[PDB]
Write a protein that binds this ligand. Structure first.
Ligand SMILES: *[C@@H]1O[C@H](CO)[C@@H](O)[C@H](O)[C@H]1NC(C)=O
Ligand SMILES: OCc1cn(-c2ccc(Cl)cc2)nn1
Length: 355
């Protein structure tokens, strides 16, 4: 179990002004630290944030959080469940800012909600340095879904923060799971006039304004004002980064298909067959020059904190093994690969896909 700590700096808050926080399980014999970012979509105006507050309030507030949480998958402390980092110090950071971890705005007489995701990460790092993180050799910033995108947006800022604080020896790295999206054409079109129909590019453009969103400096300097939404898309922001980042991405991610207005129920036809095959090929193409990556040909969503994350394989190598091979490479290795991308072109052409 991981134990809840609410942030001592009460100005760093969830959407509704309640304190943000983190769940921690220490491993005093270890100098490895894993900080995991939860996911769960986002909201981008008053009306759709109000809806989220009625029926998704744990993603908006800490007032009902439980005192503990069980570590699962890569957050498990049992070697049978977590062959990769079972002995590390474990941290789970709840997603309560609805801003893809990019916001830097407080609640005020001008703002009904606070959007502080980027500041929550920095405050968690600061308060952990007093609880053992000061002695770390590696800090791995991981996350799933919106948390995976959050890794891409924040990993270099964590690195810069520790450097300026006097800790140049801590190696910051990132692990982005199911957060690598494409700004592609939808299979069927919908005009952005309310939430249902509003494509990611437009929703994120409005979000950055609503959230006072922050993106990495180098990417911001390339795309410039009004175009920072580009930095929320992995294939555009990744080349600007400097911290080592391992990318885990299903070729046919269910959230990607949702934003593309694809609904698979049933006998496809030719038009949709070609659309799905082209999506797989495009994703594959964006990963061609990503040296640490794991991309199976499955229709699924998230993986690294699922209890059965050990079961999927690409070219005979599991995800925990590929992550271990990555660790070795950061000290090619014979029989210990780090770049693993399926080539077959249809969902579940890989027999190890989740059922
Ligand atoms: C609390 O957090 C805010 C927002 O990041 C920051 O400006 C302030 O300096 C912090 N205060 C302390 C005492 O850490
Ligand atoms: O949990 C599903 C999910 C998807 N997203 C998301 C994030 C960024 C972009 Cl650019 C598109 C989609 N966030 N959460």
């Amino acid at each position: 179990d991981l134990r809840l700590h609410l942030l001592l700096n009460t100005s760093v808050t969830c959407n509704d002004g309640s304190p943000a926080g983190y769940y921690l399980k220490e491993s005093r014999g270890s100098r490895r630290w894993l900080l995991f970012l939860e996911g769960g979509w986002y909201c981008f105006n008053r009306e759709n944030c109000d809806s989220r507050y009625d029926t998704m309030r744990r993603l908006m507030s800490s007032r009902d959080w439980p005192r503990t949480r069980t570590g699962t998958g890569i957050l498990s402390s049992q070697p049978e469940e977590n062959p990769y980092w079972w002995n590390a110090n474990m941290v789970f950071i709840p997603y309560c800012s609805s801003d893809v971890w990019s916001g830097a705005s407080s609640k005020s007489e001008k703002n009904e909600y606070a959007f502080m995701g980027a500041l929550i990460i920095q405050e968690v790092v600061r308060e952990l340095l007093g609880r053992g993180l000061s002695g770390a050799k590696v800090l791995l910033l991981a996350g799933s879904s919106a948390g995976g995108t959050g890794v891409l947006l924040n990993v270099d800022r964590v690195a810069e923060q520790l450097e300026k604080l006097g800790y140049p020896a801590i190696q910051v790295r990132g692990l982005a799971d199911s957060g690598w999206f494409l700004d592609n054409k939808q299979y069927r079109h919908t005009d952005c006039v309310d939430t249902i129909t509003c494509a990611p590019t437009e929703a994120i453009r409005r979000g950055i304004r609503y959230w006072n969103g922050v993106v990495p400096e180098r990417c911001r300097r390339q795309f410039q004002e009004g175009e920072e939404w580009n930095c929320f898309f992995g294939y555009k922001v990744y080349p600007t980064l400097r911290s080592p980042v391992f990318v885990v991405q299903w070729l046919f991610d269910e959230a990607q298909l949702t934003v593309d207005n694809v609904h698979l129920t049933g006998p496809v036809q030719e038009g949709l067959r070609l659309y799905i095959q082209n999506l797989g090929r495009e994703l594959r193409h964006t990963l061609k020059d990503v040296p640490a990556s794991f991309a199976p040909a499955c229709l699924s969503h998230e993986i690294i904190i699922r209890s059965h994350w050990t079961d999927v394989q690409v070219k005979g190598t599991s995800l925990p093994r590929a992550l271990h091979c990555w660790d070795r490479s950061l000290h090619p290795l014979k029989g210990c690969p780090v770049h693993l991308v399926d080539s077959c072109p249809w969902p579940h052409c890989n027999p190890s896909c989740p059922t």
